[PDB]
Amino acid sequence: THINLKVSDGSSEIFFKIKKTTPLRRLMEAFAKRQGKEMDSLRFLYDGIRIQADQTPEDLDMEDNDIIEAHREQIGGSTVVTTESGLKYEDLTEGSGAEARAGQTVSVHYTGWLTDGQKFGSSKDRNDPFAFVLGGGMVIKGWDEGVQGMKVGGVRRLTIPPQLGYGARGAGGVIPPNATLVFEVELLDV
Numbered sequence: 001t002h003i004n005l006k007v008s009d010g011s012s013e014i015f016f017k018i019k020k021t022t023p024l025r026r027l028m029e030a031f032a033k034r035q036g037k038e039m040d041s042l043r044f045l046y047d048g049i050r051i052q053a054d055q056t057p058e059d060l061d062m063e064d065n066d067i068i069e070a071h072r073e074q075i076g077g078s079t080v081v082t083t084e085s086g087l088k089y090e091d092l093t094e095g096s097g098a099e100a101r102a103g104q105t106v107s108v109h110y111t112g113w114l115t116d117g118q119k120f121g122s123s124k125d126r127n128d129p130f131a132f133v134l135g136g137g138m139v140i141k142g143w144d145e146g147v148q149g150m151k152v153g154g155v156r157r158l159t160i161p162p163q164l165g166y167g168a169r170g171a172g173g174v175i176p177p178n179a180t181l182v183f184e185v186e187l188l189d190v
């Protein structure tokens with residue numbers, strides 16, 4: 001009557017036990033919400049086929065310990081850029097207006113995760129935007145570099161190697177030495 005399912009996006013892996021007659025909506029919402037996102041930002045595939053919120057394990061002939069693969073889809077497309085430092089960035093949404101430049105004070109919202117999907121931080125927790133002088137050395141190097149060129153309204157995903165993050169030290173009782181960090185940064189003002 002019930003099966004176990006694993007949902008993975010390549011980083012976060014979440015395990016669920018679900019009645020076979022239960023629609024996949026709750027499971028899908030749960031996975032999305034754990035990344036601080038709305039369900040409609042993701043696409044969930046079973047056996048290469050896209051799952052819809054109203055379908056059940058029964059409708060799809062799912063078995064115990066099956067896997068659902070989760071991906072974000074941007075309708076715009078996906079282009080990930082590697083810079084000379086080894087920083088990677090992907091504009092999920094492009095903003096409007098002038099590009100943020102070195103020396104400007106910027107205000108952003110962000111969420112940060114480890115490569116196992118664990119959230120270590122977010123400005124949305126206290127609903128308090130984060131401000132800093134871009135290129136001023138008051139944030140990790142991945143940020144001083146990666147927020148350059150964003151426009152207001154833009155959402156940019158940064159993949160930050162540890163020499164551009166917290167290096168050998170880690171941070172916050174959460175990020176260990178030599179960790180790669182993933183942030184989604186939204187530029188609010190420049």
Ligand SMILES: CCOC(=O)[C@@H]1CCCCN1S(=O)(=O)Cc1ccccc1
Nearest residue numbers: 112120121138139140143171172174175
């Ligand atoms: C004040 C300097 O902070 C930073 O440079 C980065 C980027 C700018 C915003 C905050 N972070 S943090 O989330 O990684 C900080 C963090 C790390 C580990 C656990 C919690 C928070």
